[PDB]
Amino acid sequence: PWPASLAALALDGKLRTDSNATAAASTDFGNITSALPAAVLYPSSTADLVALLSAANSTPGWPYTIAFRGRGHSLMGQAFAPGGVVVNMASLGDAAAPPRINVSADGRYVDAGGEQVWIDVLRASLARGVAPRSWTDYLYLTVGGTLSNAGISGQAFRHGPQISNVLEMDVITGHGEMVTCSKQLNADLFDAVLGGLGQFGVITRARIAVEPAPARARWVRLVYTDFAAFSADQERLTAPRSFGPMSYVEGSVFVNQSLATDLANTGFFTDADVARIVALAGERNATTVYSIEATLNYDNATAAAAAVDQELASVLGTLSYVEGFAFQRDVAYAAFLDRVHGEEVALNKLGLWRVPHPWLNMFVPRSRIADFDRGVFKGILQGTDIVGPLIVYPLNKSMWDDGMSAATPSEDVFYAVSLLFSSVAPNDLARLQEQNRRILRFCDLAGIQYKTYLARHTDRSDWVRHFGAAKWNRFVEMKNKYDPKRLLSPGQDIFN
């Protein structure tokens, strides 16, 4: 038997079983794994989500796992529901009204539906002169999706990840109950869901912190051939003072074998800049080149320009990049934030965007980053042609709430390391997959206490080590409380 509300969804054509629907929700950005669901839900309101979850919660023996598809940027099927039901979250925002993004009257925050993509949260905020403080490198991701992970970019060192910039949320648990939570209300759910990997319920609304919107961003890249100087400078720029003046700080690694090509593909350096950097590497006999990427946000004041120059000159004076290797660009704030969109459009036309992405994302404690550099950037990765950015930058643990579900190293400073490999060449995917296991194996043998991010483990003992035994027990407790049937986001392979 079907509950009245569940059957109603079928009549209205919200529950689709046709191969067209199920196929679209069977693949993700990773383009490595795939799994067909039994059906796809195209909800028009949060009421439809309650109906589905209430049904599953009340129906004994309910055999349908449920996942919430934001924009499917998952890499290894985290948004699939094998033989289950996939919720097409975007459907919540098709109705021209009411709005799914509402900037508060006082301009202190912005309410956004869990299905909304950050690029739109940004446009709706800028219209009101404000903007979120913490981002992801790419804006075409959903609010609920990044919040289910962490959401990190070059601003996290001073504002923490996106999960540290949420005032409250509306969540529908695995029991089908609508609950509003925050640090002062149903905190248990609030903490569990943030970085919760969609295991406790679906986020329908998230209240995101905002700050006055800067007009422009002075964007710079500094070049190094010495990793010690590179990492020391990133740490200096992101160290607590209160923080330095930089609004964003990330870094990049360029292996020698594909140096000229990777520098050109940054979309930042001119061919003249590239030639100078390639010559520098040859002079130093470097097998790797490093670049710090940073910005300084500022407004359209009359003195702003001159002030930014002074501020930058001052900051750069405290650094140790190679003399004369500082490169600047000045752009509108929104242009900087949406910089990766340009990369997608480009690569997609060449058929180089929708290809396998055996990405490796991890947090490495500061005390072992130099060892990681030697073993990976100067070791394992040498002798290969790399297409895709190799991003590395420090984060401050003080901005992360360990009470939340996100797991991080124990050190005060740890690095986000994102090796965004693209299997652009033919079946070059097997090589890349084996290479990532080799990197992980190298870290295990060297005793590096890293934490994987954006990855799902197919073995229980691995998830326990990921969270940590005590934190794991907590995760399980919260699981037996909000989704005892183990139906939500089975693609994480945690309880499924």
Ligand X SMILES: *[C]C1=C([C])[C]=C2N=[C@@]3(C(=[C])[C]/[C]=N/C4=C5[N][C]=NC5=N[C]=N4)C(=O)[N]C(=O)N=C3N([C][C]([O])[C]([O])[C]([O])[C]OP([O])(=O)OP([O])(=O)O[C][C]3O[C](N4[C]=NC5=C4N=[C]N=C5[N])[C]([O])[C]3[O])C2=[C]1
Ligand Y SMILES: *[C@H]1O[C@H](CO)[C@@H](O[C@@H]2O[C@H](CO)[C@@H](O)[C@H](O)[C@H]2NC(C)=O)[C@H](O)[C@H]1NC(C)=O
Ligand Z SMILES: *[C@@H]1O[C@H](CO)[C@@H](O[C@@H]2O[C@H](CO)[C@@H](O)[C@H](O)[C@H]2NC(C)=O)[C@H](O)[C@H]1NC(C)=O
Ligand U SMILES: *[C@@H]1O[C@H](CO)[C@@H](O[C@H]2O[C@H](CO)[C@@H](O)[C@H](O)[C@H]2NC(C)=O)[C@H](O)[C@H]1NC(C)=O
Q: Is 354 in the site for ligand NAG (CB under 6 A)?
A: yes
489 annotated as a binding-site residue: yes
Binding of ligand Y at residue 202 (CB under 6 A)?
A: no
Q: Is 208 annotated as a binding residue?
A: no
Q: According to the annotation, is 101 in a ligand binding site? A: no
79, HSE (Cβ side, Cα atoms, 13 Å): 29
Catalytic residue flag (residue 120): no
Annotated active-site residue in 28, 73, 373, 428: 73
What is the distance in angstroms between the CA of the first residue and the CA of the last residue of the chain?
25
Among ligand Y, ligand Z, ligand NAG, none, what does residue 31 contact (CB within 5–8 Å per kind)?
ligand NAG
CA distances from 421 to 79, 258, 349, 369, 416 (A): 21, 13, 19, 20, 16
The residue within the footprint of ligand NAG, chosen from 31, 57, 102, 452 (CB under 6 A), is 31
User: Taking CB under 6 A as the rule, does residue 287 contact ligand U?
Assistant: yes
Asked whether residue 142 is marked as a ligand-binding residue, the answer is yes
CA angle 13, 17, 23 (to 5 degrees): 120
Does the footprint of ligand U cover residue 288 (CB under 6 A)? no
Closest separation in Å from C-beta 155 to ligand U: 34
Enumerate residues 6+ apart whose C-beta is below 8 A from 235: 366, 394, 413
Alpha-carbon distance values, 195 to 16, 34, 249, 403 (Å): 30, 23, 22, 10
Distance (Å, whole) CA 57 – CA 154: 41
Q: Which residues, other chains included, contact 465 with Cβ-Cβ below 8 Å and sequence gap of 6+? A: none
Q: Which string of x and - marks every residue 255-274 that binds ligand U (by CB under 6 A)? A: -xx-----------------
Q: Does 352 bind ligand NAG (CB under 6 A)?
A: no
Q: Annotate each residue in 280-309 with x if it binds ligand Z (CB under 6 A) or - if it does not, as one string.
A: -----x-x----------------------
φ/ψ of 305, rounded to 5, equals -45, -60
Omega prior to 3 cis, within 30 of 0: no
250 is catalytic: yes
- Output the six-digit token pair for 174: 């695995």
Which DSSP symbol is given to 16?
E
Q: Are strands 326-332 and 216-224 parallel, antiparallel or unpaired?
A: antiparallel
SS (H, E, C) 275-335: HHHHHHHHHHCCCEEEEEEEEEEECCCCCHHHHHHHHHHHHHCCCCCCCCCEEEEEEEHHH
Please, what is the minimum distance in Å from the beta carbon of residue 477 to ligand NAG?
Answer: 35
Interaction with ligand Y in 203-262: which residues (CB under 6 A)? 205
User: How many residues sit in the footprint of ligand Y (CB under 6 A)?
Assistant: 8
The interface with ligand X within residues 183-242 (CB under 6 A) comprises 197-198, 202-203
Q: Candidates 42, 109, 138, 254: give the one binding ligand X (CB under 6 A).
A: 138
Residues between 194 and 233 that touch ligand Z (CB under 6 A): none
C-alpha to C-alpha distance for 134 and 215, rounded to whole angstroms: 16
- Which residues line the annotated binding site? 68, 70-72, 74, 78, 137, 142, 148, 152, 203, 343, 418, 453, 489, 492
Binding site for ligand X (CB under 6 A): 29, 67-74, 78-79, 89, 114, 136-138, 141-142, 144-146, 148-153, 197-198, 202-203, 340, 343, 361, 389, 418, 420, 454, 489, 491-492
- Which residues line the annotated binding site for N(6)-dimethylallyladenine? 137, 343
